[PDB]
Amino acid sequence: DTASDAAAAAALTAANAKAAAELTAANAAAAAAATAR
């Protein structure tokens, strides 16, 4: 049904947005550490 579908889409949007924040910070931190060596 449409409300289950929309709740599931909201769940995927939040999980991907959080993962995008996480991985961006990790990447930036990893690039700065490798550069310094």
Swiss-Prot record:
Identify the keywords attached in UniProt to this record, alphabetized: Amidation, Antifreeze protein, Repeat, Secreted, Signal
Origin, by domain of life? Answer: Eukaryota
Where it sits in the cell: the answer is: Secreted
Q: What is the effect of changing residue 7 to K?
A: No significant effect on 3D structure
Tissue specificity comment: Detected in liver and in blood serum (at protein level).
**Inducing stimuli:** By winter conditions, at least in part by water temperatures of below 8 degrees Celsius.
Q: What are the annotated GO cellular component locations?
A: extracellular space
The record's principal subcellular location, in a coarse class, is secreted
Q: Single GO molecular-function term?
A: antifreeze activity
List every position bearing Arginine amide: 37
Effect ascribed to mutating residue 35 to V: No significant effect on 3D structure
How the protein is affected by changing residue 33 to E? No significant effect on 3D structure
Summary of the function given for this chain in its UniProt record: Contributes to protect fish blood from freezing at subzero sea water temperatures. Lowers the blood freezing point. Binds to nascent ice crystals and prevents further growth.
Family to which the UniProt record says this protein belongs: Belongs to the type-I AFP family.
Q: What is this protein called?
A: Ice-structuring protein A
Q: What species does this protein belong to?
A: Pseudopleuronectes americanus
